[PDB]
Design a protein around this ligand. Structure first.
Ligand code: 3PI
Length: 514
């Protein structure tokens, strides 16, 4: 029997007999196509181990009608689902079978519930696990683990009602001597009120990683005494009071383009004890275009003759390299330079989240534990306002949205690169990372829904959805790396080179039955 298995809360919405799945690798196979509220299940008993294709609906970007009435070929009348996970799926229907319309309509409806005024499956997934992923991350405790608040850094509550910055977490760590009303001001100079706050502190040197958005300098060199005092306050916090380093993730010309617009960067006149460096990491649009090119040379057949040159033309591994190289520069400046660094971009959610979290992964072994990693994600990504729902387009039929970009995917890709370079340094395994990427799109859990901490609170995700961590941690074994424990040498320093970075076959090329 060709019925899909059903998760608690999941159910069949449509079924189709005698549909043909056209496997680019194994030719065609006739079986039964089923659509649930969660998934797209195809299964044929026309083979042996029965043929099964199980794909969560969340990965579907587009559903196209293939062929028409004037389609007289064989397997020319059908559907094609364009996926988010580096594949496209296509099925053939018989016109007289009268199933294509029903399937097409149910796919459109259940793969894009938000566009059809329906819930995302996460709200109807009523499975129950022993551990509760929602209680895993505790801002206050994480800060405490870092030896936060101390004399130099305090915790303010000025953003508890999300009034200071609605895309920031409720609790913020700032210089022990900067008053709430002053912060209220730096917030006026920083884009979207995303002021420089603490992300990490060296246990020893008390060199810091702070994060923020760009300074609203504009065409005319606008300055903020308070912002300048703020960055100064950050420097006065290092017991070996060098200076400051400001890493602008952006290429130079982008930073300037932004300045025309109203944004900009910290000049050497305005911020003196500050050294600014541009990391040349392009925007969300460039990264979307890069992944698009990659999917083409990867998905169905790879053209072996020109793989290397084709891969180069995508500029994928290059973006990955600049992101890791950037994280490296930050880590080194903190660790070896004993210097505090301020990280930003334009808005400070995207590239900034990539940099802080990777540098933090290089510097703090805690973040390399399975559970530590989950916290890093909850912290740097979720709590700090990476716009997941927007960047992925959860249950939204508008596949051409310019807001869609694989920012988090790049991050995970960079994390994977480090596991390759340091196979004993991480407690989690590849499966763990790939699983994370699958549920990033699945919308089975509420972990990657909404766009800010505030929103997830108002939506009451902890109570209405299951945390991905609940599933993962009540399972640890599937996601544990056996070689772990030995990275006594505590600062990871991967090599960001085109010769040391590989294309993540495990993820981008996993559909081939080899
Ligand atoms: C004051 C200027 C502010 C700004 O961000 O402007 C730029 C655009 O300008 C043109 O398109 C028009 C020029 C007339 C974009 O400048 P730019 O740096 O090229 O690009 C940003 C950057 O990628 C942000 O992430 P982050 O900085 O955290 O890594 C995204 O969130 C933002 O998109 P979204 O949030 O709106 O979806 C995107 O526009």
């Amino acid at each position: 029997m060709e019925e899909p298995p059903l998760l608690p809360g999941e159910n069949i919405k449509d079924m189709a007999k005698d549909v043909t799945y056209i496997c680019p690798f194994t030719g065609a196979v006739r079986g039964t196509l089923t659509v649930t509220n969660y998934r797209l299940y195809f299964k044929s008993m026309e083979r042996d181990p029965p043929f099964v294709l199980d794909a969560s609906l969340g990965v579907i970007n587009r559903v196209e009608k293939i062929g028409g009435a004037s389609s007289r070929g064989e397997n020319s009348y059908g559907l094609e689902t364009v996926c988010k996970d580096i594949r496209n799926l296509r099925f053939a229907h018989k016109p007289e079978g009268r199933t294509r319309r029903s399937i097409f309509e149910n796919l459109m409806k259940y793969a894009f519930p938000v566009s059809n005024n329906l819930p995302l499956f996460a709200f109807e997934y009523k499975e129950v696990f022993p551990e509760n992923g929602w209680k895993l991350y505790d801002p206050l405790l994480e800060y405490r683990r870092q030896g936060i608040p101390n004399e130099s850094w305090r915790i303010t509550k000025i953003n508890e009602r999300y009034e200071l910055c609605d895309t920031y977490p409720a609790l913020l760590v700032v210089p022990a001597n900067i008053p709430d009303e002053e912060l209220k001001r730096v917030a006026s100079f920083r884009s979207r009120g995303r002021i420089p706050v603490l992300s990490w502190i060296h246990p020893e040197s008390q060199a810091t990683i702070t994060r923020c958005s760009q300074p609203m300098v504009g065409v005319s060199g606008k300055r903020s005494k308070e912002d300048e005092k703020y960055l100064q306050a950050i420097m006065d916090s290092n017991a070996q009071s060098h200076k400051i380093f400001i890493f602008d993730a952006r290429p130079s010309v982008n930073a300037v383009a932004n300045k025309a617009k109203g944004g900009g960067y910290e000049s050497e006149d305005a911020y003196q004890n500050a050294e600014l460096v541009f990391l040349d990491i392009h925007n969300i649009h460039v990264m979307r275009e890069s992944l698009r090119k990659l999917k083409e040379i990867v998905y169905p057949n790879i053209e072996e003759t020109h793989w290397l040159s084709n891969l180069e033309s995508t500029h994928w591994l290059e973006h990955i390299k600049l992101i890791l190289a950037g994280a490296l520069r930050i880590a080194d400046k903190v660790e070896s330079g004993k210097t505090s660094v301020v990280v930003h971009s334009s808005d400070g959610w995207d590239r900034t989240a990539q940099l802080t979290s990777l540098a933090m992964l290089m510097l703090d072994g805690y973040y390399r534990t399975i559970r530590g990693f989950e916290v890093l994600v909850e912290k740097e990504w979720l709590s700090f306002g990476h716009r997941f729902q927007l960047r992925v387009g959860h249950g939204d039929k508008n596949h051409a949205d310019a807001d869609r970009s694989p920012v988090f995917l790049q991050f995970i890709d960079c994390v994977w690169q480090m596991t390759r370079q340091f196979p004993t340094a991480f407690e989690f395994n590849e499966y763990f990372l790939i699983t994370i990427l699958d549920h990033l799109y699945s919308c089975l859990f509420g972990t990657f829904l909404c766009n800010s901490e505030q929103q997830r609170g108002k939506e009451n995700l902890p109570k209405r959805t299951v945390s991905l961590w609940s599933y993962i941690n009540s399972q640890l074994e599937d996601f544990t790396n056996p070689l772990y424990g030995s990275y006594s040498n505590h600062v990871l320093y991967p090599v960001a080179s085109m010769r040391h970075l590989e294309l993540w076959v495990g993820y981008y090329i996993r559909w081939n039955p080899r």
